[PDB]
Amino acid sequence: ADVPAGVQLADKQTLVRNNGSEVQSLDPHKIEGVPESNVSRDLFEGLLISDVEGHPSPGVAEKWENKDFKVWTFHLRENAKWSDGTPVTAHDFVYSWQRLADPNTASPYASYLQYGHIANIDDIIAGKKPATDLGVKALDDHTFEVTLSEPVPYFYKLLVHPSVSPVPKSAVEKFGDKWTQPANIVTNGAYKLKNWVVNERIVLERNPQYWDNAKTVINQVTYLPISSEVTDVNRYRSGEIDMTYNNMPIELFQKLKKEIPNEVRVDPYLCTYYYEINNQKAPFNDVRVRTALKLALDRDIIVNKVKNQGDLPAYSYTPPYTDGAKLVEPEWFKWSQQKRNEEAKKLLAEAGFTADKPLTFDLLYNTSDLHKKLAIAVASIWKKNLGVNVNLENQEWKTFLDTRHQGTFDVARAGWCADYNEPTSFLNTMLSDSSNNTAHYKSPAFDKLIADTLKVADDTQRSELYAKAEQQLDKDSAIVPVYYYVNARLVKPWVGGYTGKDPLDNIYVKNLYIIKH
Ligand SMILES: [U]
Ligand SMILES: [U]
Ligand SMILES: [U]
Ligand SMILES: [U]
Ligand SMILES: [U]
Ligand SMILES: [U]
Ligand SMILES: [U]
Ligand SMILES: [U]
């Protein structure tokens, strides 16, 4: 943390943050969500990290170079250490990235190494080559070298993500799935795991072995798993919680902005809210059905009337303000909702649906006051505008993610937030073979458009190809875009260091501090 001259620090430097739900895991190769990543950043540190405003900056790697954007060499700082005092080396990274690639690990982020194009990854994921053939090597204890199969100018931006953080081989091998228990875990970020009570709390304490430990201010941070946004706000206002999670309750938001305006932080966020259609399941394998659902949803009502927190109506998957996005707004987005509804009803009529044999399916969402209110609104809109019936179903966060991976669903609410600020952070997740593809969408034309983006060595051709990739996704109605998120949360006046400038919201508790109050 960089405490400004003249600020007086509180005697007790502890922080309590709400974190939305119980995490899937603390193992960096088994996680895929925001709640998980929030804790991961305080515990595991990769080659690069985001600074307080979001810029890619030195992590374990203090400096790096590239040859032709294809061979990347990372010089690791000599004092990087794990919490047990052992050095962090390039061998930790070789083992870690191989473990991420290995199909036996079944990482939901195994495809992250395809997004960076590390050599031999396709073959490794397919089981044709062992994970030890991955294009990584330790040239020495402090030098990690990555070889890509084609030039990737933005490759280093990918490296702040939890999937490419190191994991401690000896703990993994000795304890298997219990390596992340407090008595067994070993970490290399600014914090160490002190306590982990499922469905109650996660408590982290400063890691004195962290190389940048002299600059860490917060000595302990607790992450809570509260999925009720009302309860989160209530426990913030009662004094228990210093930072809420960033899901705000429809019941209280407008009142909160009038009551404690300086605490309500609302900033740009590179996430898209959408309804994920299971593309492989009848009748959702019919484009007419997907298009109908997409069109009949009234984004103005959802965004301006039901949520009303500053989000923007969406007509794409990639947010239009992503660095490198120059998207073309489809004509259907400029039609009236009435015209959208007529087109929707006609397509369902064409698809074989009638008043007597209507379209009925499930709408799955992770337990939440906000997502339940949004799902109820969407259900009513779809009923009214299109004559479709939906059965709402809630599931705890971890189970919800697994259901979508299993494809044991019809439609599900969903949010994707960038991992790196570049359109492929979104678009690569719709590739046929992507491990993050829970839409179960498979388009050879879409796959080709993205594949062509690294075959050109020009930004304008790349941007035009992303725009066309979004047009292919839209033409196929792979998803139902709802809105581009704003990042809205409550933050006590005494929490310093949170700028709100990072559009990815990659917060590190090592960068915060408690002002005397
Ligand atoms: U004190
Ligand atoms: U106090
Ligand atoms: U470039
Ligand atoms: U650049
Ligand atoms: U940029
Ligand atoms: U269903
Ligand atoms: U509620
Ligand atoms: U106080």
> Could you tell me the residue ranges of all domains in the chain?
1-44+169-270+487-517, 45-168, 271-486
What distances in angstroms separate CA 289 from CA 187, 277, 352, 355, 480, one per listed residue? 48, 10, 10, 15, 11
Distance 26 CA to ligand 7 centre (A): 30
The position carrying tokens 């995490």 is 23
Distance CA 370, CA 373 (A): 5
Query: What count of Cα atoms within 13 Å lies in the side-chain half-sphere of residue 306?
Result: 22
Distance of CA 385 to the CA centre of its chain: 32
Phi–psi pair at 302, nearest 5 degrees: -60, -55
The torsion angles phi and psi of 226, rounded to 5 degrees, stand at -80, 120
Beta carbons within 10 angstroms of residue 300's beta carbon: 9
Q: Which CATH class is domain 271-486?
A: alpha beta
Which tokens is 213 given? 């430990």
Give the number of the ligand closest to the Cα of residue 234: 7
CATH number of 1-44+169-270+487-517: 3.40.190.10
Element (H, E) at 188: none
Cα of 431 from ligand 3 centre, angstroms? 24
Ligand 1 mean position, distance from CA 463 (Å): 55
* Distance (Å) from CA 153 to ligand 4 centroid: 7
Identify the nearest ligand to the CA of 11 by its number.
Answer: 1
With H, G, I as helix, E, B as strand and everything else as coil, classify residue 51. Answer: coil
Task: Enumerate residues 6+ apart whose C-beta is below 8 A from 385.
Answer: 296, 298, 337, 341, 344, 345
Residue 6: alpha-carbon gap to chain centroid: 36
For the domain covering 45-168, report its CATH number: 3.90.76.10
The pair phi, psi for residue 509, each rounded to 5°, is -65, -20
- Rounded to the nearest angstrom, the distance between the alpha carbon of 226 and the centre of ligand 6 is 28
Q: Which residues contact 167 (CB under 8 A, 6 or more apart)?
A: 27, 28, 29, 44, 92, 95, 96, 99, 179
Q: 229 and 370 in contact (C-beta within 8 Å)?
A: yes
Over its C-alpha atoms, the chain yields an Rg (Å, rounded) of 23
Query: What's the CA-to-centroid distance between 210 and ligand 2, angstroms?
Result: 28
DSSP sequence for 298-309? -HHIIIIIII-S
**Ligand 8 centroid to residue 11 C-alpha, Å:** 10
Residue 448 to residues 137, 152, 431, 472, Cα–Cα distance (Å): 30, 17, 9, 11
Strands 411-417 and 264-277, sheet pairing: antiparallel
**Closest to 114 measured CA to CA, from 59, 158, 76:** 158
Distance 323 CA to ligand 5 centre (A): 6
Span from the CA of 467 to the centroid of ligand 4 (angstroms): 20
Residues 6+ apart with CB under 8 A from 98: 131, 132, 134, 136
- Answer whether 132's CB lies under 8 Å from 458's CB: no
- Which DSSP category does 451 fall into? H
Contact 481, 439 (CB under 8 A): no
DSSP assignment of 216-270 equals ---SEEEEE----HHHHHHHHHTTS-SB--S---TTTHHHHHHH-TTTEEEEEEE
Q: Report angle CA 119, 120, 123 to the nearest 5 degrees.
A: 160
CB 413 within 8 A of CB 275: yes
395 vs 379: CA distance, rounded Å? 17
Instruction: State how far the Cα of 443 lies from the Cα of 27, in Å rounded to an integer.
Output: 32
**DSSP-derived 3-state class of residue 151:** coil
Sequence-distant (≥ 6) Cβ neighbours of residue 320 within 8 angstroms: 327, 484
CA distance 221 to 224: 10
Cβ within 8 Å of residue 349, ≥6 positions away: none
The rounded Å distance from CA 66 to ligand 4 centre is 12
**Ligand 4 centre and the CA of 33: distance in Å?**
28
- Elucidation technique: X-ray
The Å distance, Cα 394 to ligand 7 centre, comes to 14
Task: Note whether 19 and 227 are within 8 A (CB).
Answer: no
345, 387 Cβ separation under 8 angstroms: yes
Q: What are phi and psi of 440, to 5 degrees?
A: 60, 40
CB 201 within 8 A of CB 195: yes
CB 180 within 8 A of CB 107: no
Judge contact between 35 and 182, C-beta under 8 A: no
User: Separation of 11 CA from ligand 1 center, angstroms?
Assistant: 5
Using the Cα atoms of residue 487, residue 114, residue 408 and residue 473 in order, give the sign of their dihedral.
positive
* CA 411 / ligand 6 centre spacing (Å): 9
User: Ligand 6 center to residue 409 CA distance, Å?
Assistant: 7
Q: Which residue has the tokens 């994707």?
A: 416
CA of 500 to the centre of ligand 8 (A): 26
Residues with beta carbon < 5 A to ion ligand 6?
362, 410
Ligand nearest to C-alpha 517: 8
> 514 is written with which tokens?
């408690």
Give the integer Cα–Cα distance in Å for 209 and 187.
9
Place of tokens 């909160």: 256
Please give the distance, rounded to the nearest whole angstrom, from the Cα atom of residue 421 to the centre of ligand 4: 13
CA distance 113 to 100: 8
Listed residue (103, 79, 107, 204) closest to 165, CA to CA: 107
10 Å CB burial of residue 314 (0-12, 13-18, 19+) is buried
CA 421 to ligand 5 center in whole angstroms: 8
Q: What kind and span of H or E run contains 452? A: helix 444-452
Q: Do domains 45-168 and 271-486 have the same CATH topology?
A: no
CA separation, residue 5 to residues 9, 184, 325 (Å): 11, 40, 39
Terminal Cα-to-Cα distance of the chain (whole angstroms): 19
358 Cα: distance to centroid of ligand 2 (angstroms): 62
Could you tell me which residues come within 8 angstroms of residue 422 by beta carbon, excluding any fewer than 6 positions away?
154, 157, 322, 323, 324
Closest CA to 167 of 298, 31, 66, 67: 31
Q: Distance (Å, rounded) from C-alpha 404 to C-alpha 113?
A: 22
Could you tell me the distance, in angstroms and rounded to a whole number, from the CA of residue 69 to the centre of ligand 3? 10
C-alpha distances in Å from residue 513, one per residue of 217, 240, 300, 396, 510:
6, 17, 39, 32, 8
* Residue showing tokens 């969408």: 441
Q: Does the bond joining 130 to the residue before it have cis omega, within 30 degrees of 0? A: no
AA identity, residue 406: Q
Pairing of strands 61-67, 71-76: antiparallel
Distance between CA 264 and CA 241 in Å, rounded? 14
C-alpha closest to that of 93 among 153, 140, 32, 42: 140
CB atoms within 10 A of CB 154: 18
Distance (Å, rounded) from C-alpha 148 to C-alpha 80? 25
Annotate 280-347 with DSSP letters as a single string. TSTTTTSHHHHHHHHHHS-HHIIIIIII-SS-EE-SSSS-TTSTT------GGGGS-HHHHHHHHHHH
- Do residues 284 and 294 make contact, with C-beta atoms less than 8 angstroms apart? no
Q: Say how far apart CA 497 and CA 3 lie, in whole Å.
A: 8
